[PDB]
């Protein structure tokens with residue numbers, strides 16, 4: 001009873017797992033003269049609310065509410081213009097002077113979260129309004145630059161179709177296919193790489209040749225480099241209240257050994273997924289272009305590549321049976337690893353099946369992807385009214401019948 | 416003074432609903448010097464805005480701009496050594512307190528910035544006042 005004084009003083013958070021149920025049941029049924037009253041008293045006038053609540057909880061089966069009502073009834077809870085003019089309506093936090101690490105209005109604070117996927121949970125970063133607008137002007141500049149780009153396939157369906165048809169012809173011809181999947185693309189990249197890339201670039205104008213200065217871009221990218229992310233609290237109680245874990249060890253090393261409890265994380269290389277997609281896209285595109293140019297000049301074999309900012313595909317058109325070229329593939333892997341483009345072991349580098357955006361292409365035809373569409377149709381019953389549900393089922397069935405599934409199956413879905 | 420006397424003439428369309436309205440009005444009209452008028456004009460406009468906002472919600476205007484400790488010690492209540500903070504509007508009834516801090520921001524980003532800052536600086540006070548004293552309910556009135 002008294003242990004709430006030394007511990008947290010909130011009576012509404014007292015857990016029932018610390019005390020037995022028999023003691024709670026028998027304690028609430030003890031003597032109480034001024035803490036209970038006769039009758040239910042549905043009118044409930046002001047001044048006697050606790051007594052009515054205690055009576056209503058006692059007449060019911062549950063006694064934990066009665067116990068906490070008894071606990072709270074017993075009172076166990078016991079002339080310059082720059083300093084004097086910043087409190088009425090003055091917007092002191094307006095961004096007017098900024099440094100390389102902040103903007104006089106925060107530090108681009110972020111929040112971590114999850115999003116469920118079929119394989120493994122995907123990272124997610126939520127931004128406050130200021131950092132949202134800042135990263136969003138970065139986004140707009142980067143989509144502009146990538147719209148100037150030609151080989152990118154992230155938001156241009158024409159180039160995606162060109163890549164698809166080139167892939168189909170390549171498979172039909174006997175082209176060399178390299179479906180590259182990059183591991184840890186998000187948590188490995190750092191803004192400083194983009195800083196160096198944009199510092200070394202020129203970004204020439206179409207007609208003026210004026211060599212646009214990206215000073216604002218550099219400053220905001222430095223801001224992004226100096227972003228701070230706040231850890232979710234739930235893991236904070238999970239680790240504080242209390243199997244060997246490295247992050248749990250780091251927490252156990254950093255509650256009072258160096259400072260206070262960890263609540264804000266700050267480091268060099270984060271590149272929050274969902275925040276710098278297109279800048280990383282253009283960086284990967286130009287790096288892959290450099291690599292394919294190097295392959296052309298070294299191994300006299302003709303490369304083409306398509307990149308989607310997370311995975312890429314490279315077609316190798318060969319002069320003049322597939323065991324004489326492991327060396328250049330290892331060389332390309334080494335050079336990519338020299339850059340910040342580590343390749344996951346899931347990449348397949350032969351010439352029978354090609355992969356891009358989960359759309360396999362094989363000699364002669366294309367995989368129907370039946371069971372994926374069937375499972376998608378069976379799931380995601382987004383129900384508000386029957387009419388919209390019929391519309392959604394119709395759309396999903398159209399998508400399913402597009403990839404040659406069957407028509408004796410869609411009838412069963414309709415049934 | 417092409418606009419100073421113009422401002423004095425055109426600010427006459429104001430209702431002195433409260434005593435402090437006239438108290439600040441007479442001081443403003445009886446003082447024409449380059450350095451103060453902007454300061455007390457801003458403060459009178461802010462006082463009008465906060466008065467509208469708080470008597471929108473059963474106000475008791477803080478004409479003294481004093482701390483929470485003294486207003487809690489006005490009646491019989493022990494001092495828990497509360498951290499200092501200046502309230503805009505207070506209403507205490509029985510053993511309860513209702514706190515209202517209002518502001519105005521024409522741009523959204525600054526509006527939620529001030530809202531979050533005020534909410535954070537008013538939440539932390541409950542953990543100290545509840546331990547050895549009475550409650551409070553913090554309400555924030557933000558006007559765009």
Ligand SMILES: [Mn+2]
Pocket residue numbers: 179180181311312355356357
């Ligand atoms: Mn892939």
